[PDB]
Amino acid sequence: STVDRLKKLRLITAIKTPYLANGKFDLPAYDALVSHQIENGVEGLIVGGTTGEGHLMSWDEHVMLIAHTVNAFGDKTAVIGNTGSNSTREALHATEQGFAVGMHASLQINPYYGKTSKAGLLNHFNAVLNEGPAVVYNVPGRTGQDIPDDVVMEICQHSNFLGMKECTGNSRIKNYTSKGVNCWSGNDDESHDARHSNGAVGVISVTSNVIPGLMHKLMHGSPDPQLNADLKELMAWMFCEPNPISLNTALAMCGLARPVFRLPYVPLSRAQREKGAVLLNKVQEHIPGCKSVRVMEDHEFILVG
Amino acid sequence: STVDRLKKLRLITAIKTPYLANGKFDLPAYDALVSHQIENGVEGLIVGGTTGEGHLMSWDEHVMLIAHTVNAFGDKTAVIGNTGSNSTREALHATEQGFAVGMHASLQINPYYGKTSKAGLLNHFNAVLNEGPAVVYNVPGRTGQDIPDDVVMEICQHSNFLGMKECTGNSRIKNYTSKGVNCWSGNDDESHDARHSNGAVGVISVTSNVIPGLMHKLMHGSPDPQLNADLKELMAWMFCEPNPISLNTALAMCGLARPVFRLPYVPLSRAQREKGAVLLNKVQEHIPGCKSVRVMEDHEFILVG
Amino acid sequence: STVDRLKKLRLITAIKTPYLANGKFDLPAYDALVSHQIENGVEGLIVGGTTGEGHLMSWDEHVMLIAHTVNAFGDKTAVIGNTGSNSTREALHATEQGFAVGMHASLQINPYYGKTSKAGLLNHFNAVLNEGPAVVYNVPGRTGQDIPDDVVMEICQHSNFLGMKECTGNSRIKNYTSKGVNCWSGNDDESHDARHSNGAVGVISVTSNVIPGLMHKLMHGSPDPQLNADLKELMAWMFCEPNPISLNTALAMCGLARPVFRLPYVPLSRAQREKGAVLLNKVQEHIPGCKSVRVMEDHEFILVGR
Amino acid sequence: STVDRLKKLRLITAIKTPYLANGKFDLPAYDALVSHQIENGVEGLIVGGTTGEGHLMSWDEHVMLIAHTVNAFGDKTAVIGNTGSNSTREALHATEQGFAVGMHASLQINPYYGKTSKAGLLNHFNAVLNEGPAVVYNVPGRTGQDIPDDVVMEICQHSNFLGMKECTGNSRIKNYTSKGVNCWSGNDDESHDARHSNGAVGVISVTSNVIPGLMHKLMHGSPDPQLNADLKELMAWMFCEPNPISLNTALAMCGLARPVFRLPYVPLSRAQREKGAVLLNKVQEHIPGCKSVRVMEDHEFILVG
Numbered sequence A, B, D: 001s002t003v004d005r006l007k008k009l010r011l012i013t014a015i016k017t018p019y020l021a022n023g024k025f026d027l028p029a030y031d032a033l034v035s036h037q038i039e040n041g042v043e044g045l046i047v048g049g050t051t052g053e054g055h056l057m058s059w060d061e062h063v064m065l066i067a068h069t070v071n072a073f074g075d076k077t078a079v080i081g082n083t084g085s086n087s088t089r090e091a092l093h094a095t096e097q098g099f100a101v102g103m104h105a106s107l108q109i110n111p112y113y114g115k116t117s118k119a120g121l122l123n124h125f126n127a128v129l130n131e132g133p134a135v136v137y138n139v140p141g142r143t144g145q146d147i148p149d150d151v152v153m154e155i156c157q158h159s160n161f162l163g164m165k166e167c168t169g170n171s172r173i174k175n176y177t178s179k180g181v182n183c184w185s186g187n188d189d190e191s192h193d194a195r196h197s198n199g200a201v202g203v204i205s206v207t208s209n210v211i212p213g214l215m216h217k218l219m220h221g222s223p224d225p226q227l228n229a230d231l232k233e234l235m236a237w238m239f240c241e242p243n244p245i246s247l248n249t250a251l252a253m254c255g256l257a258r259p260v261f262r263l264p265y266v267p268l269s270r271a272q273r274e275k276g277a278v279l280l281n282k283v284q285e286h287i288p289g290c291k292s293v294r295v296m297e298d299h300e301f302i303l304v305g
Numbered sequence C: 001s002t003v004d005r006l007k008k009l010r011l012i013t014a015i016k017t018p019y020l021a022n023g024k025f026d027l028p029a030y031d032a033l034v035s036h037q038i039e040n041g042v043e044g045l046i047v048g049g050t051t052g053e054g055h056l057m058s059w060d061e062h063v064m065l066i067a068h069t070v071n072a073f074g075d076k077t078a079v080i081g082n083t084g085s086n087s088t089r090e091a092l093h094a095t096e097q098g099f100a101v102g103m104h105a106s107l108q109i110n111p112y113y114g115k116t117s118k119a120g121l122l123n124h125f126n127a128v129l130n131e132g133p134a135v136v137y138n139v140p141g142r143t144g145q146d147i148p149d150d151v152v153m154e155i156c157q158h159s160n161f162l163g164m165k166e167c168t169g170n171s172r173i174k175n176y177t178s179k180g181v182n183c184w185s186g187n188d189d190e191s192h193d194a195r196h197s198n199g200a201v202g203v204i205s206v207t208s209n210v211i212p213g214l215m216h217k218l219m220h221g222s223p224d225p226q227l228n229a230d231l232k233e234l235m236a237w238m239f240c241e242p243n244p245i246s247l248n249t250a251l252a253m254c255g256l257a258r259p260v261f262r263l264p265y266v267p268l269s270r271a272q273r274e275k276g277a278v279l280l281n282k283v284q285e286h287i288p289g290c291k292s293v294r295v296m297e298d299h300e301f302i303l304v305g306r
Ligand SMILES: *[C@@H](CCC(=O)O)C(=O)O
Pocket: A014, A046, A049, A050, A051, A052, A139, A167, A186, A187, A204, A205, A206, A243
């Protein structure tokens, strides 16, 4: 029942984690961002995902953020803690504590960097799936390892399997969905076509942080190729440096988060922010709480490490 | 002086981290392994590198292992703590403490998984290089990101830059070494030619864990293409699943570590162990402390997670 | 407003932290215990207090337990995280995170073991009081240091000061309450008289874990000195070894927690459990969810810590 | 043999842990202090004891400090890590890692604050004694619990039992030593008589941090009641606020550590420092490396917390 409901969510935001000047979490900024997400049709949140810089958190601040999100918003949105890890003990510890504070599901990446065998992946994934509902996250461009079809076709039969957050493209998604494997696209620039032509239930999105109502439009009803085309340049700019560099820069430019980065992330250059401001200005009415888009000066940004 | 001496080491072992039945470190097995390495010409150790499963350790056990290695062996071998991370604060914290316990240098990977921009890499690497001597570790097959030449040509001018642990091949190494950038090969199957034909000072090795004296032979004196050819099948078998799966299985088969795996690593299959036993038997006299090679049964292996 | 409401709570339970066989938290047992507390009139919980073995937890499991308690029960009971420490940085880190997950207040002991000066105490307490509402916890029999009156009379003026959890007796409480300092008694065997004759708002209780409805009766309405007298033997048995040894043994005996101890705590002896079973049987109808009281055998107990 | 040697040490210093302005460890100041201790006849160190503010450290910095002390000084002095705790698992974890980095012994307090039964104490102490040589530390004025004689008479038979660090007085010590239980006095103002009239092997000292050569004189050869009398006022001043408040203030006043306190410790008042300067000036030639003795102004002190 909880499984069945979560499987049908079409718009999940991998929520940005905003920071105070000293690098600690800015919960007022986080809460304002989440409220705007929910008012614009976002049905769930990945807390401390790649976009949310989960890998730059200590576990105690991450479980705090998950707990806080459940307590403030868990009746209004699905709360999916990114509690996966390349260490099985670390994944199990974090995932168990995440469910203990009331998160609805986990996001579970395959072991990045410390790559394992097929047998290792089945052990790791079965163990985390036993803890509660899980989205399985495939992103070989980051992890160094593609989760193979054979693994997915086995673990998809687990009663806590929600689906894939698939980043290897719409052909991969089409093959999975044609065999009854539920998929979210992890790539904003592919998500419209994933949803409308390849059987994806929807998207786990970066760009929704900025324009949640427009990503909602892209995921519901008839294909909207005009909106998809109108968002193309913005979506490319969101990944001109690795995510979440553009997102972090964009939210600062829109007055929605402080210009504070945890290293090793640093902001986009002045020239890239100039290009970005034009793209953000075109959709400013759909950036909730945005009063104006500023290019910003290099000295405004604070690096914490 | 310390920098100049470390730059000349030809055989460094990325030492395996052996485990007790309960998953904690087996320091008697570790110490026996290290002593065998030293008696066979190994000049340095990476402590808790990829091969040593540093990513599966908590920091307190990792700093303990580094400290233990310095105190027991630091007058007999170079001790290089793998204190890098995809989190800049984590890298700085670990690297500082590692130097405070007397390690001679660090190994510093680029941020894996949470990939950053060129500006981010320069910030991250300059910060860790300021802590003390560092080997810079490029392995895009694991990290999802190649450290580009432009970055290396900038950071190689740092006074604490020891060189690259380069895994993208002998052509990469030849270009770097021809421009005065010191390189160790990170690939055993390429290391002989890296050393003898491409200017590499030597190797940071996995296979040295098993046959340290033979890896020593490959790094010193005349080219030895016969030995290199004789070790080809063994070297391929060492990577038939991702490292350190074969290594961990091999050491158990040879009676040199307990058959205990921290998840997500699991042993090679029975069939793969059969193939391996034949290859290990061919070099048994060069496996220090090995009394016999056993194929082993599946039930003998213990998984901790 | 939040301060004013919290100051009036009369029955707070220093909730026991139950364990699985492997020593990790048993949240099903914890949640069953808490629900029974709330149905019997308990108005607040100290999470990971002395009784809850907060000092045997890692911070991540402690913040998890606080967060879990807020999310499952925070609309039905006050959640007071025991986030104090003898390390000021540790106290500030834990207390801040505790409030960030929605706890209503903290419990703040003076630095035990690593005892400091009067100036040190004022610095430490002002710092933790700035984080949010706090109960200040004085128990020199455990800490090695009595928080002196002059310190209390200074820090009681902080707008986040809720009161003392005072363990040095009813005379101490009477002096504080006569000068406008809100107090809860930390001693069950003194709590009835603290409440009814010495101006204490009520009790932060151990025995409420076992008989919450009876402790509720002792704290509300008219004096009930007969009930207080009737509970005297049980209350003494609850402290025949240092708390929470008897509590942990009792909840196992009553089938309300597994017989699992984190070291350095170990169960009461067989002979002490025999005496206890008789006392627990007398009040079994007031032990919520208790199906029977067993003496238990020594081999049933599991010690975790190695 | 190691046990027998350690049992005979007469002067052990509970070494102060000096801090940088930002509150992190000042290892240059620490190393200068330790070298001066060793040159003045100090035979061992308690690292991160009560006096060393072990309870204000994270375990990773504490094991670092132990490891550093072993590596720099372990051939010249006994290194005793204060790895005890009121949590048995925490004590075992820290004590094991401490021995793994080469410390010679542990200091093991009874569980403070979270007081346990007699059966609990025997379990706790047997467990930590099994890890390696241990001094057992009784200080009920801090812990809230006196370790009773029946516990001591049982655990004193353990082959790793070194003796008591006893703080309940010379009568307690005399009774223990008359029954074959080796004792160090934990109270500087009692230590001369403990040593010369009550069978104590010697002292685990605070005041030795300041005047190590004078504490050495009090522990060796004939009674020196004149020196003992001459040090009476200084010894009382060292405890006019709880240790290590006076020590921390004194070392700053003598230019031997920075005026930096980790909370909840704060310096002595101006008036107490005035009294102290007079007492320190009287023994200045016996304060190794001592600059002028300065009273100091209140604004010079830095509180970190
Ligand atoms: C998913 C976003 C996809 C990406 O940047 O690769 C997430 O968890 O942030």
